[PDB]
Structures are given as C-alpha cells and as structure tokens.
C-alpha cells in the first residue's frame, strides 16, 4: 500500500484534515491505509472511513446517473456508452475496495455489536451500490440483503431502537427494499416500525442523544411521505 510507510496516527490526523479541506479522495486513501494497519477502528474512526467513501462513491453515483439518463435518451456514436462504462468501472472499483477492507478483515475482527453492526451495514450499502449499476445482479442483491439482515438481527438484540447506527441501518435497508429489491411494502413496513419504535424510546434519552436519533427519524419520515 502507498500508505504503508506512514504512521497510523498520522493517517488518522491527515484523514481529518482532508475532511476539513473537502478532499474526500485523499480522505478515503488515508483511511484505507489506516484500516490496513490491522488495528480496530474507534467509533470516530469508523465514521471517518464511512464519510470518506460515502463522498467518493457519491460523486461517482451522481455522475453515473447523469450519464445513464443521457445514454437512455439517445436510445429512444459509442461515446456516451463508453464514458458511462468508464465511470461505472471506477465506481465498481471503489465498491470492491471497500468490500475488501470489510472482508479482510474489519468484520471478523469486530469484537463488538456496535463495531460489527457498523461494518455489516457498510457491506450492505456497497453491495447496494454495485446493484444500482448491475445488469450477477440477482447475486449482488442477495449479498446486500444478507449483510443488511445480519446487521438487523444483531442490532435488535444488542442496541436500543434509538441508536443512530441502528436507525441508519434500517433507513438504508428500507431504501434497498424499495428501489433495489422491488419490495416497496417491505420498505414501508421497515421504515414505519423503525420510526415508531424509536419515537417510543425517545423519553429515555439525553438532549444530545435525542438530537442524534431525531435527525435520522426525519429521514425515515421524508421517505414514508414519498412512498405513501
């Protein structure tokens, strides 16, 4: 790895600077190196990894969707298809890289429910991103579904219904159900039960945790308002 000669602590520090600078490709490269040191990631460091790749693949996804729509319009020279494939291939590479970090060996070394759920959610997310562009598609969908489901099983056993990672997990699993798995009823069922069970637990929370949970509840709210 190109980051193998840098100290773990220096990589984490520079990942934070990269975030402040909105240099998310640098951020991801630094966090990739941090992961490959072989030591667990703290909660803060898990968020750094997630935010970094969210922004990198996010730009790829938005670019892909622009190109894919233009491509479809021109089917109602090869350059539009060629460039969509270029972005698509670069997007799949990023997803394969994140999934490699998780399988080697973040998930197996996650000796916590909190840490393990976080990584399993990430596994579902980046198989979901591969499914968005897949046309093996069925097999990718099952990999995401399975990663999401195991995270759900653990989260329900080990974490309260207001935990932000659990809420973010159910949010994204509901989106998977709605737009990837062709299961809009599952998506609705999941979003509302998650919302309702979180609201019934808010009375147990501090003003700060309250803010954390209600911020993700708003996203469940907006989706249900769109789907029903």
């Amino acid at each position: 790895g190109a980051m193998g000669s840098m100290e773990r602590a220096s990589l984490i520090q520079k990942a934070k600077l990269a975030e402040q600078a909105e240099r998310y490709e640098d951020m991801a490269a630094f966090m990739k190196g941090a992961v490959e040191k072989g030591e667990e990631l703290s909660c803060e460091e898990r968020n750094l990894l997630s935010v970094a790749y969210k922004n990198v693949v996010g730009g790829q996804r938005a670019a892909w969707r622009v190109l894919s729509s233009i491509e479809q319009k021109s089917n109602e020279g090869p350059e539009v298809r060629e460039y969509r494939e270029k972005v698509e291939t670069e997007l799949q590479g990023v997803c394969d890289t994140v999934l490699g970090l998780l399988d080697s060996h973040l998930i197996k070394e996650a000796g916590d429910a909190e840490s393990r759920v976080f990584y399993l959610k990430m596994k579902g997310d980046y198989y979901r991103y591969l499914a968005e562009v897949a046309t093996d598609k069925k097999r990718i969908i099952d990999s995401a579904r399975s990663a999401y489901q195991e995270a759900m099983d653990i989260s329900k056993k080990e974490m309260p219904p207001t935990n932000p990672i659990r809420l973010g997990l159910a949010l994204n699993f509901s989106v998977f159900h709605y737009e990837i798995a062709n299961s809009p009823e599952e998506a609705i069922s999941l979003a509302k039960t998650t919302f309702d069970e979180a609201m019934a637990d808010l009375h147990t929370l501090s003003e700060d945790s309250y803010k954390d949970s209600t911020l993700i509840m708003q996203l469940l709210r907006d989706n249900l308002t769109l789907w029903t």
Binding site: S50, G58, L169, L171, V175, Y178, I216, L219, D222
Partner: peptide, 8 residues
C-alpha cells in the same frame, strides 16, 4: 429523491 443515511 429518497434519503439514505449518507444524505442527511
């Protein structure tokens, strides 16, 4: 466009 956890 629906929200995922990475869009808040």
């Amino acid at each position: 466009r629906r929200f995922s956890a990475g869009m808040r």
